[PDB]
Amino acid sequence: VYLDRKLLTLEDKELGSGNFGTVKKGYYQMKKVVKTVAVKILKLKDELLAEANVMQQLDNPYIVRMIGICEAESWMLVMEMAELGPLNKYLQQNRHVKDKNIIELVHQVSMGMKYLEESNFVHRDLAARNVLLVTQHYAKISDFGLSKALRADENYYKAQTHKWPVKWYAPECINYYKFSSKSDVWSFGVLMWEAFSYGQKPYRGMKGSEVTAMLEKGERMGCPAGCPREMYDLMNLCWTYDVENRPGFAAVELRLRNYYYDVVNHHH
């Protein structure tokens, strides 16, 4: 859990920045090899510790692995490096990525979310900006800062007091402050829309309240250019208003798995 600061080398240039503080590239002296790492630096401590406590429990290829934690000048969260960075920024910069490759990447996210659902953990921040690329064909889910381990007796997490990424939030999140794997299914639909729109922001030019008003009228975002009908139908199904009728990640993953192999064998 706790790492040796003497074994950690941080780069001067920062990878990203936000509410948290900063993300910097580094190197950690492992068992015999040296491991390139992404380091979240705080510069709040309870939120970093809880985030590390969640990541310490997760074991899946489609989730970012935590190496450990370190207390130096600031509190640090050391993670395995996903070199190509956020999915949204990647697709904005690489607008010629094929449709089959986008299906492949969103399917990876669904396999990691299928795992999270089975482990009864709610992500609560599932967006294309929180998907990181190891390769152009290898996605991992990151950002477990809002993530919760569900109580043994509850299928949801109830938030006590409402910043919230409302454009990604299911109606029950807005209306009842209730966060479940099925609300993560809603966010995954928005994620699918972003990926097929090549990292474009959802509900362009709209306020949070205007989004709520639009969803309340039964209106949904349209089909992105070049997005197959089958993929847009899945997005719409993730956008089922009623939580009970909305599919779970095992059904979402199966839909995507089958479609991907249908496209794969069709290309041959």
Ligand SMILES: Cc1nnc(-c2nc(C)n3ccc(Nc4nccc(-c5cc(CN(C)C)n(C)n5)n4)cc23)o1
């Ligand atoms: C903003 C922003 N945040 N990250 C970037 C960013 N930009 C480029 C070009 N990157 C390249 C590699 C990379 N690797 C990488 N690996 C493992 C973990 C992480 C990572 C990043 C975050 C922060 N979240 C807000 C995403 N956490 C919690 N974990 N990051 C990140 C990155 O931009």
